[PDB]
Design a protein around this ligand. Structure first.
Ligand code: V0M
Ligand code: ZN
Ligand code: ZN
Length: 589
């Protein structure tokens, strides 16, 4: 089918592992082309490492089911195969000809709108090097060593010369030093050709209208509140089932239209990324066999490779396009007859885009596969023909059952959170991010690496605690647990690793600066929705959620076990201090 594009990559893998290369007839691949297997040592673990510092200071959550579940993520070849079979080995039916036509018209208009002020450009070796260096001082260490080796860049140049001839020899996606250099080299080449979407803020709210890039978790609630003021129907936030697996060959060709705005030298490189690694891909996946573990080499023409970071911007683009198409259907612009029609009237779609498209983009908050839409009316709730036909089937709901919208922006699911408007004691309002408290505690109790010292583990606990003090201060249990962790860890110990990989995280908690000072900077000084810049001088003036809402959202406040924990927390803090040693601590309780 496509061996002329993927053949050189498979030939190189096969030559490198010819001692154990074989065709396994028991391969479970149904929708992916299977090329072969070779022996590998199994990677991953059946369960996550536990952060003992966070665990010792959150004893009431030792029982809680969601907390116990989050520590059971299986990353072994058995776990990889399970996820692959249940989620990735699917085929999306091809959209109808009228659906493909409206998508193409909308994609061309959207790219033109997105590129009205900005022009695409190539990203560079020093840009990638700087990003890698700033992230290593938060594998990043391995990546920092690779960017400092001139042989890595000479390998990058050889692969770029193949891409310029329309060939690919080593850009393989993963579901010795040489293979790590080839993977990081593939990521560099992708960054060089498509990194501009992220680096130049193409999906910022000012540039894209719907986008939220660069806003930060602390600003998303304010944007949903601003959207709530636009006249129209309810706010809809439908979750797509496995968004990345529903990116069709038609979606990929619509995303590729951005190459039309590039300079010749950039278009050549971006066309190679689109054709060789996005629209044709070679993937490695581990699989357990009766006699050991193999690495399977598979390929397909559609879906995304999640590891690519160019996928965030392209997912945002395709979601903005799909939601505009759904809004057109709700408004009666797109009928069932149009979706089936190759010959639909292009001009009525163009006219709707040119007269109402930007206004309709302003009614949305879109981040990758996450969307919030406030349509002009509720007909949108039942406009499902185009959405299902485009392959974006909603998760856990019958295909034709109407979407449920929200009339309170505070109840809307966006980027794994919901948002509350709080009234401070001085009358000022704050709009804060929130999620089930068991998820926040469960995540903070997971360590990220093996062989970590008590220092590295305590510093990751401190990073989680400071993130809670800045984003989730309004949750009573989290402010208390945060104070306990910060009192148990040396004040000069710098938080390490990362609390989240989310694009919305700005990592203001990765500091040894006083958290109240940082809180003031984020919530008051730099908050554009805070008109009165009066600083808050004490945590007693930093508000909480309403007790009832805190309890509805997972708080243990009012339980006897929680009261016992709060009363005995100086004892647990002292136990952690005793094991850390004679360092400088501070009492935050
Ligand atoms: O860029 C990077 C990771 C990164 C680090 C070092 C070198 C390059 C990259 N990126 C990159 C690559 Cl390899 C290929 C194509 C395009 C890009 Cl831009 N990260 C985010 C940022 O802005 O800090 C963007 C993002 C997107 C999704 C989720 C989180 C974040 C934070
Ligand atoms: Zn390549
Ligand atoms: Zn909440």
């Amino acid at each position: 089918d496509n061996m002329d594009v993927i053949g050189e990559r498979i030939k190189r893998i096969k030559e490198e592992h010819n001692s154990t290369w074989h065709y396994d007839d028991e391969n479970p691949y149904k929708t992916w082309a299977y090329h072969g297997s070779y022996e590998v040592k199994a990677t991953g673990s059946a369960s996550s490492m536990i952060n003992g510092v966070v665990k010792l200071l959150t004893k009431p959550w030792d029982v809680v089911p969601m907390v116990t579940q989050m520590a059971m993520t299986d990353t072994t070849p058995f776990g990889q195969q399970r996820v692959f079979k249940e989620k990735v080995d699917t085929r999306t039916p091809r959209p109808l000809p009228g659906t493909r036509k409206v998508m193409e018209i909308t994609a061309e208009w959207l790219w033109r709108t997105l590129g009205r002020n900005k022009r695409p450009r190539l990203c560079t070796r020093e840009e990638f090097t700087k990003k890698v260096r700033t992230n290593a001082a938060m594998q990043w260490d391995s990546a920092k060593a690779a960017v400092e080796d001139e042989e890595f860049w000479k390998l990058v140049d050889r692969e770029r010369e193949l891409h310029k001839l329309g060939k690919c020899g080593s850009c393989v996606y993963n579901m010795s030093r040489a293979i790590w250099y080839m993977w990081l080299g593939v990521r560099y080449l992708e960054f060089e050709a498509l990194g501009f979407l992220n680096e130049d803020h193409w999906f910022s709210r000012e540039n894209s209208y719907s986008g939220v890039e660069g806003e930060g978790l602390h600003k998303l609630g304010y944007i949903l509140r601003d959207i709530s003021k636009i006249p129209g129907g309810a706010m809809y936030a439908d979750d797509t089932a496995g968004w990345d697996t529903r990116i069709t060959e038609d979606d990929l060709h619509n995303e590729e239209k951005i190459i039309q705005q590039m300079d010749p030298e950039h278009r050549q490189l971006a066309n190679a990324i689109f054709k060789l690694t996005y629209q044709n891909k070679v993937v490695k996946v581990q699989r357990p066999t009766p006699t050991g573990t193999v690495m399977d080499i598979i390929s397909r023409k559609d879906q995304r490779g999640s590891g690519q970071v160019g996928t965030y911007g392209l997912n945002t683009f395709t979601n903005m396009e799909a939601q505009l198409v759904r809004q057109m259907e709700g408004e009666g612009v797109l009928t069932k007859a149009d979706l089936e029609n190759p010959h639909l009237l292009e001009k009525k779609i163009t006219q709707w885009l040119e007269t109402k498209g930007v206004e309709r983009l302003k009614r949305m908050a879109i981040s990758g596969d996450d969307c919030v839409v406030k349509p002009i009316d509720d007909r949108f709730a039942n406009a499902l023909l185009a959405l299902n036909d485009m392959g974006k089937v909603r998760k856990d709901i019958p295909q034709w059952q109407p979407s449920k919208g929200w009339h309170d922006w505070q109840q809307v699911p966006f980027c794994s959170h919901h948002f509350h408007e709080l009234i401070m004691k001085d009358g000022r309002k704050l709009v804060v991010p929130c999620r089930p408290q068991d998820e926040l505690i469960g995540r903070a109790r997971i360590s990220q690496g093996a062989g970590w010292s008590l220092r590295e583990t305590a510093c990751l606990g401190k990073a989680y605690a400071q993130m809670w003090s800045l984003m989730y201060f309004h949750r009573r249990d989290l402010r208390l647990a945060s104070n306990a962790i910060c009192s148990a860890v040396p004040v000069h110990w710098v938080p390490t690793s990362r609390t989240t990989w989310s694009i919305h995280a700005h990592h203001q908690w990765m500091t040894t600066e006083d958290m109240l000072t940082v809180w003031n900077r984020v919530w008051i000084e730099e908050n554009p929705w805070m008109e009165d810049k009066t600083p808050v001088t004490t945590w007693e003036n930093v508000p909480y959620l309403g007790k009832r809402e805190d309890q509805w959202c997972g708080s243990l406040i009012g339980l006897t076990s929680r009261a016992t924990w709060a009363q005995n927390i100086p004892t647990a803090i002292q136990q952690v201090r005793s094991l850390i040693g004679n360092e400088e601590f501070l009492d935050y309780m």
